[PDB]
Design a protein that fits this description.
It is a single chain. By secondary structure, the chain is α+β, with helices and mostly antiparallel strands. It has 3 domains: 86 residues, Uridine Diphospho-n-acetylenolpyruvylglucosamine Reductase, domain 2, CATH 3.30.43; 117 residues, Uridine Diphospho-n-acetylenolpyruvylglucosamine Reductase, domain 3, CATH 3.30.465.10; 194 residues, Vanillyl-alcohol Oxidase, Chain A, domain 3, CATH 3.40.462. It is built from 14 helices and 18 strands. The strands form 4 sheets. It has a 7-stranded antiparallel sheet. A 5-stranded antiparallel sheet has the order 5-6-10-8-9. Strand 13 and strand 14 form a beta hairpin. The chain is globular. It binds flavin-adenine dinucleotide. Flavin-adenine dinucleotide binds next to strand 3, helix 5 and strand 10. The PDB classes it as oxidoreductase. Keywords: Flavin-dependent, oxidase, oligosaccharides, covalent FAD, oxidoreductase. It forms a monomeric assembly.
């Protein structure tokens, strides 16, 4: 590699091909989708990120930044062999300021973000539950978690960013400075260079936040009206509730979080309990860091910073951003789950999240206000199929997950639905993926791309192509 000798001569730290250091940074989270970079740069400073980008641009090699490496389709590698991969997980600084603003390096994992903001000032951001997820990939495409309906997606509290452009030039952007770049980073942020700092307006970390679960005993006769009643409750429910429906061969269960105490949560859910019949709510009030710890899972490191991070799964996933569904659409879905899902040997599961409703912060911005387009949808579905670490993923798994999703999406009006770039689907056609993830924002994203990455060095198979 001329690109490797360029990096060494620019005093950019790199991993030697085939070494233990290469295996540490260069093993994709998803064991189904390993990739072999041309080079792995391991910068500790913004100056080293600039030099690494300049080296890639000079040699015409595709460049991919990897923060936490949780991409379901290994897009931090580029979703193919041969990129210059810029490993960012050595840069995990979280700095909270007295005015409640925070400057965070994207290589900080969500558990480290939550731990540092909690300990520095009892502050928080609206991010998802896995603690190992990088804040870079998460916030640049959305970031949905247990307080989304009150505080928005992670990117809804972003107020600034620092980006290494594909020239190596370091720029600042905000609503008031390079606002076109700042728009694109807030939902399509892999496309425009390496983000090396994100600035946010934190919120006060709740002293009292209640997690809750509702165990259900549904079948093909009760599940359609139960899912419809769940959805209808979600449309009107207060911003303090974020919740989801989990579904697998084991049946149906509600889980969520409520900003407030247990008594208030039980009063707020009583109409949904009355819709269902014969259910009990389980609920526990904790503080914010208690809530983060609870959803991390038993025995998971809630504050991961080590370069030796090595979480893995072996899986295929897909998603659906959907408007409100009819009860007939829920019947089609439950029919698929009760027949094809029930008889499947696969360990599949899905979540149906309420992202919208009258009071939701996620559905407050218009679709065009950020690159994140799915502001008009009520539901976010995640579909997941996993096999053991030492199994090969079977191709009938693609058809199982496609069938689960299409049991809903094949009945929806064209242009009213899509997919979530944080839950990317490897099997979709390349340009159909760009429309699923960014919808009506694609045209403006292509113009931003033509301005900031005209040579399309920051590319992957599902990424935005430059068009002025
Ligand atoms: C593994 C995992 C993923 C989860 C989990 N829980 C989630 C949740 O509760 N809510 C969510 O909204 N999402 C959840 N996800 C999915 C993650 O949000 C996505 O998997 C994120 O994309 C992961 O981010 P990260 O770990 O940083 O992944 P990478 O593979 O490094 O990058 C993803 C993507 O973004 C680009 N990129 C990263 N960093 C940068 C920077 N600094 N600049 C530019 N571009 C960047 C990559 O190139 C790639 O395209 C729970 C679990 C267990």
């Amino acid at each position: 590699e001329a690109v490797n000798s360029c990096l060494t001569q620019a005093k950019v730290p790199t991993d030697a091909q085939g070494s233990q250091s290469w295996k540490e940074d260069g093993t994709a989270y998803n064991l189904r989708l390993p990739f072999e970079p041309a080079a792995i740069a391991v910068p500790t400073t913004v100056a080293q990120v600039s030099a690494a980008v300049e080296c890639g641009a000079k040699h015409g090699v595709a460049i991919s930044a990897k923060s936490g490496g949780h991409s379901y389709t290994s897009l931090g590698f580029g979703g193919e062999d041969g990129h210059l991969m810029i490993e960012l997980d050595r840069m995990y600084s979280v700095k909270l300021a007295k005015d409640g603003t925070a400057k965070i390096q994207p290589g900080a994992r969500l558990g480290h973000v939550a731990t540092e903001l909690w300990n520095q000032g009892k502050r928080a951001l609206a991010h998802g539950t896995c603690p190992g997820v990088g804040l870079g990939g998460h916030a640049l495409h959305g970031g949905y978690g247990m307080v989304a309906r009150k505080h928005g997606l992670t990117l809804d509290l972003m107020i600034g960013a620092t980006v290494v452009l594909p020239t190596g030039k370091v720029v600042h952007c905000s609503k008031t400075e390079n606002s076109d770049l700042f728009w694109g980073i807030r939902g399509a942020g892999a496309n425009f260079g390496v983000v090396v700092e994100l600035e946010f307006q934190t919120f006060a970390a709740p002293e009292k936040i209640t997690y809750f679960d509702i165990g259900l005993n549904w079948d093909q006769n009760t599940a359609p009206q139960g899912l419809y009643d769940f959805q209808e409750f979600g449309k009107g429910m207060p911003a303090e509730i974020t919740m989801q429906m989990g579904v697998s061969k084991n049946g149906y269960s509600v889980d969520g979080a409520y900003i407030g105490d247990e008594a208030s949560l039980r009063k707020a859910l009583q109409p949904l309990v009355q819709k269902f019949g014969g259910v009990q709510v389980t609920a526990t009030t904790v503080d914010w860091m208690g809530l983060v710890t609870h959803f991390a899972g038993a025995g998971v490191n809630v504050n991961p910073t080590s370069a030796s991070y090595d979480a893995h799964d072996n899986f295929y996933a897909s998603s659906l951003a959907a408007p409100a569904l009819t009860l007939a659409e829920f019947k089609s879905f439950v029919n698929f789950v009760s027949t094809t899902g029930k008889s499947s040997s696969h360990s599949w599961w899905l979540q149906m999240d309420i992202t919208g409703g009258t009071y939701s912060a996620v559905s407050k911005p218009k679709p065009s206000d950020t690159a994140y387009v799915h502001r008009d949808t009520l539901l976010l579905f995640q579909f997941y199929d996993s096999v053991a670490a030492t199994a090969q993923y079977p191709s009938d798994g693609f058809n199982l997950i496609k069938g689960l999703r299409q049991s809903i999406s094949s009945s929806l009006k064209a242009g009213t639905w899509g997919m979530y770039a944080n839950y990317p689907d490897s099997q979709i056609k390349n340009d159909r993926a760009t429309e699923m993830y960014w919808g009506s924002n694609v045209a403006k994203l292509e113009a931003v791309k033509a301005k900031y990455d005209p040579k399309n060095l920051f590319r992957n198979p599902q990424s935005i192509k430059p068009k002025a």
